[PDB]
């Protein structure tokens, strides 16, 4: 149940500066007043991050997804290789109530969207649902920037999240905040690309500015400092500058 979108709204793929964002707790070990060196998948400091003002983007190894969303227009994500019934696919949705995680071989068309009538009920993303393996229901995740990290290692899918109010106009703020781990999934898929979902105002769709930022992850070494209470308060890249 979907229609081809004639009004292919343009989201220009701009480039901007990552600064010092993309720091997450790699383990579950308490530490205090210690400098710890660790080699893992991270977002390099002062990298070059893509900005969209929903095409297909490869997953690479990991994804850093940031959104200074207002009124929660972002809906969810689709993960898979071909996003068809021929390959197992994953779906994540976060509406007003409980969030839902689904693992099935759905049927996907060119423009899967949600829409909503102003009566607030509309869902026309996929057409048919095949074999379903994993079901999950949890609590809702949600001037306010939300950052997430998506990883898939050894058949385990890891989602890290962190939200924080903001006051800057457009660019990413030059602050530091670690991304505490949120959710793990014991599902092994060959995911290589992903999508995005929007809450279009079906009232004539009104969705032309979907602002978000996307970066990728590379394996390298960082040095992290733990405060007295065990929260990461500073990080330093290794292969950035001779001083590093």
């Amino acid at each position: 149940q979907c229609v081809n979108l004639t009004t292919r709204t343009q989201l220009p793929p701009a480039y901007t500066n990552s600064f010092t964002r993309g720091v997450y707790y790699p383990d579950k070990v308490f530490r205090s007043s210690v400098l710890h060196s660790t080699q893992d998948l991270f977002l390099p400091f002062f990298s070059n991050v893509t900005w969209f003002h929903n095409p297909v983007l490869p997953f690479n190894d990991g994804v850093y997804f940031a959104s200074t969303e207002k009124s929660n227009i972002i809906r969810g994500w689709i993960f898979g290789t071909t996003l068809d019934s021929k390959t197992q696919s994953l779906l994540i949705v976060n509406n007003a109530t409980n969030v839902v995680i689904k693992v099935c071989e759905f049927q996907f068309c060119n423009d899967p969207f949600l829409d909503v009538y102003y009566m607030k009920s509309e869902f026309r993303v996929y057409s048919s649902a095949n074999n379903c393996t994993f079901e999950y229901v949890s609590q809702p995740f949600l001037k306010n920037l939300r950052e997430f990290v998506f990883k898939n290692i050894d058949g385990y899918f890891k989602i890290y999240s962190k939200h924080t109010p903001i006051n800057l106009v457009r660019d990413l703020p030059q602050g530091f905040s670690a991304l505490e781990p949120l959710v793990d999934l014991p599902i092994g898929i060959n995911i290589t690309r992903f999508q995005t979902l929007l809450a279009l105002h079906r009232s004539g769709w009104t969705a032309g500015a979907a602002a978000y930022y996307v970066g990728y992850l590379q394996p390298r070494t960082f040095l992290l400092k733990y405060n007295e209470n065990g929260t990461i308060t500073d990080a330093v890249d290794c292969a950035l500058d001779p001083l590093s």
Partner: peptide
């Protein structure tokens, strides 16, 4: 009397060994 954070399971120290 140490205060963890709500997502760790145990603590370690210099010359890594489990302590709490």
């Amino acid at each position: 009397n140490k205060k963890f954070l709500p997502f760790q399971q145990f603590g370690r120290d210099i010359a890594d060994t489990t302590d709490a």
